[PDB]
Amino acid sequence: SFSGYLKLTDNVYIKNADIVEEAKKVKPTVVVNAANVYLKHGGGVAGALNKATNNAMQVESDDYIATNGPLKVGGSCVLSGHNLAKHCLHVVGPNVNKGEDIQLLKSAYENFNQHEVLLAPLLSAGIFGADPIHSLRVCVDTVRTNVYLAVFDKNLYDKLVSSFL
Numbered sequence: 480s481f482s483g484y485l486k487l488t489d490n491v492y493i494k495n496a497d498i499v500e501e502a503k504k505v506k507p508t509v510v511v512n513a514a515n516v517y518l519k520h521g522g523g524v525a526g527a528l529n530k531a532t533n534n535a536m537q538v539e540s541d542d543y544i545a546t547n548g549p550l551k552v553g554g555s556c557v558l559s560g561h562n563l564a565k566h567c568l569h570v571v572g573p574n575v576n577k578g579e580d581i582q583l584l585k586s587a588y589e590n591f592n593q594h595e596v597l598l599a600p601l602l603s604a605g606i607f608g609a610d611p612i613h614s615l616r617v618c619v620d621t622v623r624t625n626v627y628l629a630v631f632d633k634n635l636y637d638k639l640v641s642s643f644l
């Protein structure tokens with residue numbers, strides 16, 4: 480199972496780790512992707528997860544979008560986890576760099592409550608432009624299921640742990 484995580488609350492855990500390396504190691508039931516509404520996995524966590532699947536995640540995503548249309552900001556879809564997990568929960572957090580409503584971050588984290596345990600990144604953090612300290616706060620105040628957060632950046636991980644209320 481998950482190892483080396485620091486417990487933040489009854490159900491939220493955090494580790495300074497590469498989510499791709501963490502997923503390849505643990506092979507969780509659910510890995511969360513920091514997706515956009517188009518499921519175009521170009522950069523950040525999405526680009527890294529997609530590259531680990533040898534682009535199979537993008538091929539599957541394009542078929543999903545061709546059939547269903549784009550997701551909503553704050554929404555999600557369950558697709559295959561390929562070589563990383565049983566499933567990938569593609570969750571769309573608001574992209575602050577696109578002027579998307581940050582109040583949608585709580586709606587995005589609510590998607591995690593449909594899964595008993597997840598390996599996940601901080602939603603809307605990184606290239607999505609939101610404050611990662613705010614994202615962690617929304618995570619612990621919204622998610623009731625067991626979430627194992629992988630924070631790639633060591634300096635951000637230390638800042639998140641040392642500032643956690």
Ligand SMILES: CC(=O)Nc1nccs1
Nearest residue numbers: 497498527600629630631
């Ligand atoms: C390679 C890479 O970006 N990994 C990440 N893990 C958690 C957040 S970003």
